[PDB]
Design a protein around this nucleic acid. Sequence first.
RNA 1: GCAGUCAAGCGUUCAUAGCGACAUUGCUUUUUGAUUCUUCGAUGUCGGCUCUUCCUAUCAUACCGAAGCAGAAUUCGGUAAGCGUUGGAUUGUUCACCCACUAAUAGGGAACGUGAGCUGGGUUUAGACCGUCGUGAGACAGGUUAGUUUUACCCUACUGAU
RNA 2: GAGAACAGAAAUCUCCAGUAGAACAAAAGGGUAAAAGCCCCCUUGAUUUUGAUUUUCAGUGUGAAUACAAACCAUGAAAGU
RNA 3: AAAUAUGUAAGAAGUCCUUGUUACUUAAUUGAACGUGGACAUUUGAAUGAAGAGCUUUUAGUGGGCCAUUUUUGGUAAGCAGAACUGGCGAUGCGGGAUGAACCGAACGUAGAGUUAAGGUGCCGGAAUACACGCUCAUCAGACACCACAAAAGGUGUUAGUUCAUCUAGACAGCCGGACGGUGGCCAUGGAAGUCGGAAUCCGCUAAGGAGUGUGUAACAACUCACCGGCCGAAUGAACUAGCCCUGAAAAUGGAUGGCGCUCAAGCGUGUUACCUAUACUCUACCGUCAGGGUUGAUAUGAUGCCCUGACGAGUAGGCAGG
RNA 4: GGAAUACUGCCAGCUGGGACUGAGGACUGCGACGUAAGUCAAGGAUGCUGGCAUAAUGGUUAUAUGCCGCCCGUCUUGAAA
RNA 5: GAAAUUGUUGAAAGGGAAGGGCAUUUGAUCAGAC
Lengths: 160, 171, 150, 55
Amino acid sequence: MGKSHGYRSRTRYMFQRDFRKHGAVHLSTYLKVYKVGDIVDIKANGSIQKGMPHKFYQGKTGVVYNVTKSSVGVIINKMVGNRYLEKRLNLRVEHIKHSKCRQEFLERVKANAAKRAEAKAQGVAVQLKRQPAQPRESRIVSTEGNVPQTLAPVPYETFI
Amino acid sequence: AHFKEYQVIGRRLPTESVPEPKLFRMRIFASNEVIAKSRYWYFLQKLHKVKKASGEIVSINQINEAHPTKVKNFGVWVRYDSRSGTHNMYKEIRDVSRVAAVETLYQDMAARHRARFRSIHILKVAEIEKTADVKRQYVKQFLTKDLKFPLPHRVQKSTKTFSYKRPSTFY
Amino acid sequence: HPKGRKYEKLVRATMREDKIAAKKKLHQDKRVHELARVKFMQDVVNSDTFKGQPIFDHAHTREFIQSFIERDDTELDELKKKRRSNRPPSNRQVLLQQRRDQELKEFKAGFLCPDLSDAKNMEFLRNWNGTFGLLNTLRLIRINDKGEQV
Amino acid sequence: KNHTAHNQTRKAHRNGIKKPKTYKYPSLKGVDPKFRRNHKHALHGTAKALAAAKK
RNA sequence: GCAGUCAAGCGUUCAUAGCGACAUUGCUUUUUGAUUCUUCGAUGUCGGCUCUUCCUAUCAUACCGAAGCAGAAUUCGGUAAGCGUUGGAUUGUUCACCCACUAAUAGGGAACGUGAGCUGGGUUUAGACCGUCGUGAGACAGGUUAGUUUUACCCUACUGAU
RNA sequence: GAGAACAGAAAUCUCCAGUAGAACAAAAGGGUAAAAGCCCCCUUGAUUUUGAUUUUCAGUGUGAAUACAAACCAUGAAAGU
RNA sequence: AAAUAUGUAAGAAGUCCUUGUUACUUAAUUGAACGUGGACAUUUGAAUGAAGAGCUUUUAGUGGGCCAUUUUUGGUAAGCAGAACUGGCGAUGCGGGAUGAACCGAACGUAGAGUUAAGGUGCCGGAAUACACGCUCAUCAGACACCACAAAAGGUGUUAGUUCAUCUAGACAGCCGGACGGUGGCCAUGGAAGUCGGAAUCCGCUAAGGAGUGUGUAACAACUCACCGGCCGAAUGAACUAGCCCUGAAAAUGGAUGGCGCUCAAGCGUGUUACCUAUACUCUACCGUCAGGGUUGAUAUGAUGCCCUGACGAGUAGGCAGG
RNA sequence: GGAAUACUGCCAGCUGGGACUGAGGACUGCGACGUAAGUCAAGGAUGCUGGCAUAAUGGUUAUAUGCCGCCCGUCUUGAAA
RNA sequence: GAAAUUGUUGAAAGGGAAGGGCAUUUGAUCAGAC
Ligand SMILES: [Mg+2]
Ligand SMILES: [Mg+2]
Ligand SMILES: [Mg+2]
Ligand SMILES: [Mg+2]
Ligand SMILES: [Mg+2]
Ligand SMILES: [Mg+2]
Ligand SMILES: [Mg+2]
Ligand SMILES: [Mg+2]
Ligand SMILES: [Mg+2]
Ligand SMILES: [Mg+2]
Ligand SMILES: [Mg+2]
Ligand SMILES: [Mg+2]
Ligand SMILES: [Mg+2]
Ligand SMILES: [Mg+2]
Ligand SMILES: [Mg+2]
Ligand SMILES: [Mg+2]
Ligand SMILES: [Mg+2]
Ligand SMILES: [Mg+2]
Ligand SMILES: [Mg+2]
Ligand SMILES: [Mg+2]
Ligand SMILES: [Mg+2]
Ligand SMILES: [Mg+2]
Ligand SMILES: [Mg+2]
Ligand SMILES: [Mg+2]
Ligand SMILES: [Mg+2]
Ligand SMILES: [Mg+2]
Ligand SMILES: [Mg+2]
Ligand SMILES: [Mg+2]
Ligand SMILES: [Mg+2]
Ligand SMILES: [Mg+2]
Ligand SMILES: [Mg+2]
Ligand SMILES: [Mg+2]
Ligand SMILES: [Mg+2]
Ligand SMILES: [Mg+2]
C-alpha cells in the first residue's frame, strides 16, 4: 500500500535478545554509578520498553550531562545535511554501559604521572608519547641443525 | 626478459612457542630481485600458511652456470593453464645454459600454446647426462656422428635502395 | 532474450558448486598423498614385528625412514632390467628415480617429518586413525636426520 | 525522475561538514531543577565568601 | 510438450549428490486407405496502372550425380541468376483458391519501390437515414449514401543538341 | 503418557514429563515463567499546573512517545510502582 | 560469521594534594556540583598535513538532467520501467581511438628550448622494410580494448603434448603358404551345407584356424577375413588433450582492417632495444591577479606613487570590479 | 691454484661537438686564488670585426603552397541537422 | 550625398562552391631612421 515510517520500523533483528540470554537482567546493570562527563555507549534492550532509544542511536557513543532518578541524559552528535546537531536523549540505565577506552585512557594518565614522578626522582627525563610500530633491526640466522629445505612447485594430479 | 636464476631462502617470524623456525629455499627464474621475491612469496603462500607480512626473507643470491660454454641437453617439466583446464608437459631443449633453456621454453610456450608468463610453472629443469635417454626426435637428430648440413638460398640485406646487378643466392 | 537473470543465477550456482567440489576433492587428494610416511610408520600397528617393544628410540626410527625411502626399489630394479637397449626410458622410471633422489636429498638434510617417539605420540599415533587434525592437536612431528637425530 | 541522492555528498562537502562549538560552562536549563536551585545558592555563597576572605 | 529405459561425456580424474549430447519407446484414430459437400483461411490502410534494377533461398531452359533407373515418363541431389515466368474469374480489396494455355506459370528487396507520375478507398470534417445506448444535448473504429489542394521557368540527376 | 463405575476421539478426578511448542482485543514483527500469562483483593494517576526532550523534520505545525519538577491521590508490611 | 563501509577516545576546559560554599543529598564530619591555595612546559601524552583561523549580514541563478563500471527490483526480454556508491558529460578545449557529448591520456594566460603520456614507426604520415624464437596459406585469411559480437560439433590440414600397448624370442605395411576333424551341429525350408531366419557358442588336433567377417551359388563349389608360419629389417599402433586454419547459414544500388596493399608479412603469440610527438612535466622571459613586505626627503614628479619577494591563471546560468 | 673480464654501483675525475636564452643596470652579499695590495668563471654579456645605409630588413596588401577549419542565433540530457 | 545594388577601366585567381587560422615564397605598395 503506502510506505511506513513508524518509531520501531526496520528493527526486527536490532531489538531481539541473544541466544539463551532472555529473561531478566543482572543486578550489576542497576548497581553501576554514572557521573556528569562520563562516556557511554548505547545498546538497547528489547525487554525494557520504557526509556528506549531510537534505532539511530544504536551503537553510538556520547557524554552524560544529566542524572535523574532512574535515567541519564546523554549528548549525541547527529549529521543533518551539511552540519552536526547535538541531540539530548534521556535513557534508562538498562540501555547504556560505560566505555572501556575511557578507562584505558585514565589508566594511561595515572601511569604517565607515575612514570614522570619516578623519572624526576631518578634524575632523568623519559619520553611519554606512544610510538607506532617500527621496522626491524639486523640479526644473524644460524643454520646449526637448520639446513634449508628446497621446495618446488607441485604437478597437477600426479601425486593426488 | 633475459632471465637470471636466484636462490631465495625465507622463513617464518620467530615467536612464542615457535623459536627458530624452519628455513625454506627455492630457485626462481626471474629478471630482477623484486620479481624474484614476489614469486617466492607466491609459491610459499600456495604451499604453506605463511604471508609476506607473516615471514621474512633471509637470503637472496644469484647463481651462475658452472660451465657456460658446454652444449648440454635439458629436460624441463612444466605445467600450464590453457583456456579449458591445466596440464603437465615434458620438453627437451639443447643449449648452453639453464637461463637460456628457460628463455627458449617461454618463447616456445607462447608460440605453440599461446600461454603467457602468468600461467606457466617451471616444475623442474634437469640435464640429461647420457644419449639414448633423449625422447624427442627434434633433439635426437642433432646427436648424430659427423653431422653436416648446408644452408641453401642465402639472402643478403643491403643499403642504397638500388642495386646495379641481379643478386645471387649462392652459398 | 529468454534468459533474464534467473538463468544466470542458476548457471552461476551450478558452475560454482561444481568448481568448489573439484578443488576440495583435489585438496583432500593432496593431503592423503602428503601424509603417507605417517601411514607407513602407522601400519602393522607400528611395525608389528616390534608391536611389543613400544619405544623406538633413535635408530629404529632412522631404519624406518630409510625403509620408507627405499620401499619402491623393486620396481626400479625391474624397470632397469626391462629397459631395452635402443630406447629412452619410461616416464614411470624417470619420475620414480626423481622421487628417489628428491627423498634422499631431504634425508641428507633432515630425514622425514616423522613422529617424535619420545612421548605419548606413539599412543596417539596408534589411536590416530585417519583424520588430518592429529597434527592440529597432538602431533609431536619433530623431524630427524640420517645420523644423530636431533 | 522521482528520487536520487546523486551529487548530494559533493554538495555537503563543498562548505564542509562542521562540528558545533563547545563552551566552558554549558547551559543548565534542561538539567534537574532541584540541582539548579541549590547550585544557584551555592554559587552566591561562594561569591560572598570569596569577597569576604579574599581581599 | 509430457512420461520411462538408456549412456559417450559428466559433477573441469568420483557414474548412480546432480547433469546428461546421439538414441529409444510410449500420447494425439470415423483405429482395414474410413468420414470431413469446408474457403474450418488470413487481411482495414492500402489496392491497381506504368516502369527500372538487384538478391538466390532455382520453377523452366544448360551440364552433371544417385535410385529396381529396361525403354518412355518421373523422384531426390550438385554447379549455375545467361534467359524467361501469361490470359481471365471472384468475393470491399489483396494473398490464398478456381478455369485454361504454357518449357514454366519460382520466391524475395528497393520508405511492406513508385499517398504533392496518375487513380478507387482511407487520412479528412460539415448534410441525411436505420440499429443500439443515453432523461437530454449527443455517442458508436455497428450499417448505408453524397462529399475543394491547385508547382516547375530554379539547382542537380537523366535524355538528346552546340 | 500412565490410571479411575456408567465413559465410548472427546465430560470429572490423580500422578509424571513438559524453555513456553499456550496466552497477552485486532495486521505483522519484537518482548514476557515465583510473569507482562491465569485466578482473587483494593481502587481511579484515563487527575491538576506548566516547561524540557525523541520521531517525521525546514530541525515548522499535527499525531504519538520519553525523562524530571511542583501538588493531590491509589496500592502495598515495605522498598517501590 | 568476513571484506568493504561506521560511532568514540588519544589531556592545560588536564592530573594530583589541601579545604571553602549550598536552601540538594547522606545516619553522619557522607557525597554532588562549583571553587581558593600549592605542584606539574627540552615530549603538553600516536602519525601525516594545515593554502591564515573564527564569525555575521545580504542577494543571484537552479528546482526537466543524462552516461559508464560494480551491486540490484519488476517485466521471455529491449536503446523497457525503477533504486545504491563513485567518476564524468551537461559547463570543456587539447593528444589518441579514421569518424563520435560520455572511452584512453591529460585539463587550457602569451612565447622559446628540452622531455614525455596514451597511441604508434611499408606508403599515404613524423618515426627501425629493427633484432629474436616459433605458428599460419584461407575459391569473403587476419590485423589492437569501449566497438561495429558467435561456441559445442565436424575436418585423411598442420604443430605440440598425455596415457596405454607391440617390438631383434623380429613389431607396423607388403608378397606367399596354412586356415583342419566330429559336422551337411538343432529346428524351420520346395532347397539353404559358416553366410534368407529362430535357436546357438561345444569338443578334438593345433604353430593356428569362427558351430564363422564379407563376396558368392537354386543349393554345393571357389575366394576373402579373423588367427598362425616363411621373406624383408627399425621403430610402430590406438584413444585423447589444445594452438593456428576450413565449415560451424547467409538478402537484396557499388564499397570498405580508414585506404593502398601485405604471405620465412606490412598477419598472430612473446621478448629486447632505438625512435616519433600534447595546450601535460622542467627551465627562462613577458602580461595580469592574489598575498607578504620596503620607502620622509622635498629640488623631481604621480605615498592613489616607486620598488622587492613568492604563488597562481579552464568555464555555461549567475555575481562583482576596472575601463 | 693464481688471475683477468663481464654485470651492477660510486667519484665534491678530466675532456671534445651542437642548440636555445642574456632578464637586471653606481657600490653594498657569500666566497675563491695569493704571505698581501690585488685578481676572479663569486647577488643575470661582454670584447673584437665586416657589409649596407635603402625598399636591403620590416609592415600592409593580392595571391600561391603545406596542414587544419560544417551555419549563425535559440530551446533541449542531446544541433551541421 | 553613406550602404545594399550596378557600369567602365586597371590588377589577380579559377579541373564539381566561396570565405577562415598558423607559417613562408612571389608581385605591388609604404613609414621610421641613420
Ligand atoms: Mg506505556
Ligand atoms: Mg524532479
Ligand atoms: Mg558532477
Ligand atoms: Mg545454389
Ligand atoms: Mg539477368
Ligand atoms: Mg500461356
Ligand atoms: Mg499509390
Ligand atoms: Mg507519387
Ligand atoms: Mg458525415
Ligand atoms: Mg453529388
Ligand atoms: Mg512534534
Ligand atoms: Mg587551582
Ligand atoms: Mg527557489
Ligand atoms: Mg523548467
Ligand atoms: Mg542545459
Ligand atoms: Mg563539469
Ligand atoms: Mg574532458
Ligand atoms: Mg581529437
Ligand atoms: Mg574505430
Ligand atoms: Mg610552454
Ligand atoms: Mg616517414
Ligand atoms: Mg601500419
Ligand atoms: Mg608480432
Ligand atoms: Mg631522443
Ligand atoms: Mg593553468
Ligand atoms: Mg578565467
Ligand atoms: Mg556569463
Ligand atoms: Mg641587460
Ligand atoms: Mg616588402
Ligand atoms: Mg621579406
Ligand atoms: Mg609580401
Ligand atoms: Mg578538415
Ligand atoms: Mg545550433
Ligand atoms: Mg557601393
